């Protein structure tokens, strides 16, 4: 349901609100009409993807832009500079959103957006496929739902029945797959098979893709809230951000690949570990040392990598190294700073900002 998808050229034939397409799909589903429900569910999935990509493209033009330098006098009033910059950014966002086709339809509710994020529609999808003689797509959709929720009761029974079916042992695939996931899988396979240059190329392709996806996911969390109290300026600007910050904190874990039913722990440090070993086996320590320093930055309690650092340090003059080749790579430092700042701010705000008007039921 993603073959005929292109952001640049989305068919004007199927531009409808997401809520209406979902409503029609569920109406046909309850009406025991399977073909039409399959079509409408596929339409709604494509529309959700289009909305997400439009939001990502809009948030890239505005925020990541060169800064205008104002006059000398405005440098003596910091608050006016900060909030004038915020004003300019908000204007750029609003101006950029009017021109994109996905934003000129009716926007969905928060319940429907969370519902789509929780991968709920896929449930219906798989059943429908079974009723239309689409067993491979049925098992694929069941696997895609099960991947996000591993403790559901009915889905496990469905997957057991599907696996009992003959032939259907090799169509298992994730429909909501990403680029860096497949690149990582390919590079891991190359590494396990005693080949280094291919693994290096694939991992060096995979890292920036992960970083780009991460920053787009962070930028997509700064959404709206529902109004339920009426507080002052600083006390209400700082309550919107606390919800935004919860969503941002819970964001590095969602993008982690899952292999064998278990998420890969310490994803970025694992990438650097692989990269360092591969570069060593080519005797290119000029690139092997910074990866090791980056890994030690992310995980500081590994004796293996510290021993490797000692080994590299003592052979500095043999391989002609400089101190400039002993610092972490800058992208890793940026990632480390962002994640650590977010955790510190949330821990701070969970003691001074959030009210204590609730408790645990006994």
């Amino acid at each position: 349901q993603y073959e005929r998808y292109s952001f640049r050229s989305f068919p004007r034939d199927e531009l409808m609100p997401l809520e209406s397409a979902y409503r029609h799909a569920l109406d046909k589903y309850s009406g025991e009409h399977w073909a039409e429900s399959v079509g409408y569910l596929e339409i709604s999935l494509r529309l959700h993807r289009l909305l997400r990509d439009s939001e990502a493209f809009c948030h890239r033009n505005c925020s990541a832009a060169p800064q205008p330098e104002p006059a000398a006098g405005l440098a003596s009033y910091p608050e006016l500079r900060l909030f004038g910059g915020l004003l300019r950014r908000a204007h750029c966002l609003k101006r950029c959103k009017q021109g994109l086709p996905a934003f000129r339809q009716s926007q969905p509710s928060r319940e429907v957006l969370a519902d789509f994020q929780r991968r709920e529609p896929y449930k219906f999808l798989q059943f429908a496929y079974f009723k239309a003689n689409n067993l491979p797509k049925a098992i694929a959709a069941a696997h895609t739902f099960l991947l996000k929720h591993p403790d559901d009761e009915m889905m496990k029974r469905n997957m057991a029945y599907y696996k009992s079916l003959p032939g259907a042992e090799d169509y298992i695939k994730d429909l909501e797959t990403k680029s860096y996931e497949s690149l990582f899988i390919r590079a891991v396979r190359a590494y396990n098979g005693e080949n280094w240059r291919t693994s290096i190329t694939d991992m060096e392709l995979a890292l920036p893709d992960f970083f780009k996806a991460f920053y787009e996911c962070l930028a997509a969390c700064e959404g709206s809230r529902e109004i339920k109290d009426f507080k002052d300026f600083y006390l209400s600007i700082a309550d919107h951000y606390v919800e935004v910050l919860e969503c941002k904190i819970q964001c590095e874990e969602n993008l982690t690949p899952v292999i064998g039913g278990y998420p890969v722990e310490k994803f970025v440090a694992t990438m650097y570990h692989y990269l360092q070993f591969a570069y060593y086996k080519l005797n290119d320590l000029k690139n092997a040392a910074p990866c090791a320093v980056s890994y030690l930055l992310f995980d500081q309690n590994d004796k293996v990598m510290q021993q490797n650092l000692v080994y590299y340090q003592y052979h500095r003059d043999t391989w002609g190294l400089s101190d400039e080749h002993f610092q972490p790579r800058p992208e890793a430092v940026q990632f480390f700073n962002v994640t650590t700042l977010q955790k510190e701010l949330y821990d701070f705000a969970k003691e001074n900002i959030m009210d204590d008007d609730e408790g645990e039921v006994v």
Partner: peptide, 10 residues
């Protein structure tokens, strides 16, 4: 025998 499908809300 038969996979379980969700009840239709709408």
């Amino acid at each position: 025998p038969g996979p379980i499908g969700p009840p239709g809300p709408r």
